[PDB]
Design an enzyme around this catalytic site. Sequence first.
Site, PDB file in Angstrom:
ATOM      1  N   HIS A  78       0.864  -1.168   0.000  1.00 41.09           N
ATOM      2  CA  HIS A  78       0.000   0.000   0.000  1.00 41.09           C
ATOM      3  C   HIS A  78       0.904   1.223   0.000  1.00 41.09           C
ATOM      4  CE1 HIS A  78      -3.841  -1.939   0.322  1.00 41.09           C
ATOM      5  NE2 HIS A  78      -3.486  -2.607   1.404  1.00 41.09           N
ATOM      6  N   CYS A 126      -0.087   2.760  -4.488  1.00 40.15           N
ATOM      7  CA  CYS A 126      -0.798   4.024  -4.658  1.00 40.15           C
ATOM      8  C   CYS A 126       0.108   5.162  -4.216  1.00 40.15           C
ATOM      9  CB  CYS A 126      -2.087   4.059  -3.832  1.00 40.15           C
ATOM     10  SG  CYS A 126      -3.387   2.954  -4.415  1.00 40.15           S
TER      11      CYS A 126
HETATM   12  C1  LIG Z   1      -3.802   2.204  -2.816  1.00 41.85           C
HETATM   13  C2  LIG Z   1      -2.747   1.139  -2.723  1.00 41.85           C
HETATM   14  O1  LIG Z   1      -1.692   1.366  -2.158  1.00 41.85           O
HETATM   15  C3  LIG Z   1      -2.983  -0.218  -3.328  1.00 41.85           C
HETATM   16  C4  LIG Z   1      -1.768  -0.636  -4.153  1.00 41.85           C
HETATM   17  C5  LIG Z   1      -1.685  -2.141  -4.263  1.00 41.85           C
HETATM   18  O2  LIG Z   1      -2.292  -2.848  -3.429  1.00 41.85           O
HETATM   19  O3  LIG Z   1      -1.005  -2.631  -5.189  1.00 41.85           O
HETATM   20  N1  LIG Z   1      -4.087  -0.225  -4.280  1.00 41.85           N
HETATM   21  C6  LIG Z   1      -5.281  -0.759  -4.022  1.00 41.85           C
HETATM   22  O4  LIG Z   1      -5.570  -1.295  -2.960  1.00 41.85           O
HETATM   23  C7  LIG Z   1      -6.268  -0.633  -5.161  1.00 41.85           C
HETATM   24  C8  LIG Z   1      -6.957  -1.965  -5.504  1.00 41.85           C
HETATM   25  C9  LIG Z   1      -8.102  -2.397  -4.592  1.00 41.85           C
HETATM   26  C10 LIG Z   1      -8.564  -3.802  -4.970  1.00 41.85           C
HETATM   27  C11 LIG Z   1      -9.855  -3.758  -5.780  1.00 41.85           C
HETATM   28  N2  LIG Z   1      -9.874  -4.715  -6.874  1.00 41.85           N
HETATM   29  S1  LIG Z   1     -11.233  -5.452  -7.310  1.00 41.85           S
HETATM   30  O5  LIG Z   1     -11.124  -5.895  -8.673  1.00 41.85           O
HETATM   31  O6  LIG Z   1     -11.447  -6.594  -6.465  1.00 41.85           O
HETATM   32  C12 LIG Z   1     -12.466  -4.437  -7.182  1.00 41.85           C
HETATM   33  C13 LIG Z   1     -13.377  -4.550  -6.130  1.00 41.85           C
HETATM   34  C14 LIG Z   1     -14.441  -3.656  -6.029  1.00 41.85           C
HETATM   35  C15 LIG Z   1     -14.601  -2.647  -6.980  1.00 41.85           C
HETATM   36  O7  LIG Z   1     -15.628  -1.805  -6.865  1.00 41.85           O
HETATM   37  C16 LIG Z   1     -13.695  -2.527  -8.032  1.00 41.85           C
HETATM   38  C17 LIG Z   1     -13.843  -1.447  -9.069  1.00 41.85           C
HETATM   39  O8  LIG Z   1     -13.838  -1.760 -10.280  1.00 41.85           O
HETATM   40  O9  LIG Z   1     -13.961  -0.257  -8.702  1.00 41.85           O
HETATM   41  C18 LIG Z   1     -12.629  -3.423  -8.129  1.00 41.85           C
HETATM   42  C19 LIG Z   1      -7.198   0.522  -4.968  1.00 41.85           C
HETATM   43  C20 LIG Z   1      -7.656   1.214  -6.093  1.00 41.85           C
HETATM   44  C21 LIG Z   1      -8.515   2.305  -5.954  1.00 41.85           C
HETATM   45  C22 LIG Z   1      -8.918   2.715  -4.683  1.00 41.85           C
HETATM   46  C23 LIG Z   1      -8.461   2.035  -3.554  1.00 41.85           C
HETATM   47  C24 LIG Z   1      -7.600   0.945  -3.696  1.00 41.85           C
END
Ligand SMILES: *CC(=O)[C@H](CC(=O)O)NC(=O)[C@@H](CCCCNS(=O)(=O)c1ccc(O)c(C(=O)O)c1)c1ccccc1
EC number: 3.4.22.36
Lengths: 173, 173, 88, 88
Positions: free
Chosen positions: A113, A161
């Site tokens: 993260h 992120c």
């Molecule tokens: C913010 C950070 O540091 C991390 C980096 C990392 O872990 O590599 N990023 C995230 O946590 C991002 C990914 C979150 C996981 C979501 N993936 S999903 O396909 O399961 C999913 C679930 C629910 C949803 O509504 C979606 C969607 O399409 O919107 C996807 C991350 C990204 C953005 C915001 C927060 C976290």
Amino acid sequence: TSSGSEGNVKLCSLEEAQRIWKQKSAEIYPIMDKSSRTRLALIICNEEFDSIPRRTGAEVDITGMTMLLQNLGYSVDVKKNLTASDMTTELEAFAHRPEHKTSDSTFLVFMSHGIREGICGKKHSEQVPDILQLNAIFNMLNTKNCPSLKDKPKVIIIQACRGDSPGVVWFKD
Amino acid sequence: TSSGSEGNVKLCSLEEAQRIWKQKSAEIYPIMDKSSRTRLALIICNEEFDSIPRRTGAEVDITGMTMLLQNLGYSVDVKKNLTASDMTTELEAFAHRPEHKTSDSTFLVFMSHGIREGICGKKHSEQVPDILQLNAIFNMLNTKNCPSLKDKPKVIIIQACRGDSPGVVWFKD
Amino acid sequence: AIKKAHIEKDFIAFCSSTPDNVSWRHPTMGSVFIGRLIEHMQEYACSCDVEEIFRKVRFSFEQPDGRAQMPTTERVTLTRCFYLFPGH
Amino acid sequence: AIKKAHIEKDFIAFCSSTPDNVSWRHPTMGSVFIGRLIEHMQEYACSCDVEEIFRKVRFSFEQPDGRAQMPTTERVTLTRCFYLFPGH
Ligand SMILES: *CC(=O)[C@H](CC(=O)O)NC(=O)[C@@H](CCCCNS(=O)(=O)c1ccc(O)c(C(=O)O)c1)c1ccccc1
Ligand SMILES: *CC(=O)[C@H](CC(=O)O)NC(=O)[C@@H](CCCCNS(=O)(=O)c1ccc(O)c(C(=O)O)c1)c1ccccc1
């Protein structure tokens, strides 16, 4: 074939290598003899955290990156679920590895993260931040703190992120 | 000859341009028609300061950079001795220029004293800091704050110190 | 005798997004930046220097969808081209 | 209709030194980074993309003297090669 040490990485032929050595002069980093060189790489991946959500799928990234760096000829150290302090200790230990002396390059991979300020350690929360700054990674691997990697390419890869924003704006066509 | 608009800049021939367009596919930034394009560049140079030493020789840099950017086809705005607030105002005004719409790129050149945190305005001192952060320059020129330069290369050049250190370490041969 | 060397040289950092912005990860497919980087390395390590490869990775993210991000190359002090020369 | 675009893309910054470190200037000759950049642009704009040119500028600083500095490329989101095509 993918059965060799380089796996799925497309090989550079001897004619290709000479063409690159001709299209560019002495503006390429020297590569050490394959038989004697001791290339090192480090992957730090934080998956399980105290407060922030579990980084499900990190195993795919660890597998992919580990295999790729091995394909490219690097011995890969994989460290998991570390605090910022632990990451610093590991980076310092990596900088001290004697193999760098007989290496021509290194790769550093960080997966966690992240916030604007940097990379999250396993103990991170808003109340008590656990952050490793990108600046610190550079400092620990520079010529002062890692003289063994002087004149040698140091590639840093960060999956994280860098804030809360979606990174997009709207425009009309 | 150096008597043309491009001065001392070596020209790219039509055969050279086609070779570049062949060695690389559609991975080159598109260039707008020379007859209609309105390329813009901005140089901000701080020479005279309230507290910090005079940047003697800055005129050579202003001359060199202005002429070069003109040689490359850019109309150059030169602004001198500004505070960080003035620089922000000028950058905002630059982002609002209608010529960017009919331009394919831009250059931004900053020349001043600098510290780790950023670029010094004319009023800078340790007691009352007058600093423009590099982050702010990017923000002001991005797709949100400068939609006219969407998809267009934005080159930022900064001549300034980034701290007090000499940037060197000793090693024995 | 002693000689001077640059304290910081021959670095390249590659980040998964731009400053202020999120980077994406799939629970079964992994992180798109990582997966994209491996694929491009596998394909282009033979022919392109790492800086060129990183640009190509960036290019693959150019068209923004629902999960948009723009990988960023940072603090580059590579003075030469870094070719991996896979197989050698 | 509306479409999404990356908030930050197609940037390249080129700084006169590495973070923490000084950059040099001569009272009559000007700033070495600036002078070096112009010379390299004049020579290489015809044949090299700006990223390549910036690397070449870096290379020219490789051997450290009494006034050592290492220009640094920063926060790069160029997805394509930027050729100046001087004369066109
Ligand atoms: C913010 C950070 O540091 C991390 C980096 C990392 O872990 O590599 N990023 C995230 O946590 C991002 C990914 C979150 C996981 C979501 N993936 S999903 O396909 O399961 C999913 C679930 C629910 C949803 O509504 C979606 C969607 O399409 O919107 C996807 C991350 C990204 C953005 C915001 C927060 C976290
Ligand atoms: C630190 C900063 O922001 C500015 C950047 C800029 O102005 O472009 N850098 C400097 O002010 C550096 C240059 C100082 C001018 C000295 N040049 S000199 O040739 O006249 C000179 C004079 C006396 C000396 O002893 C020397 C010498 O060889 O050491 C040179 C700068 C560089 C290092 C420290 C402080 C300032």
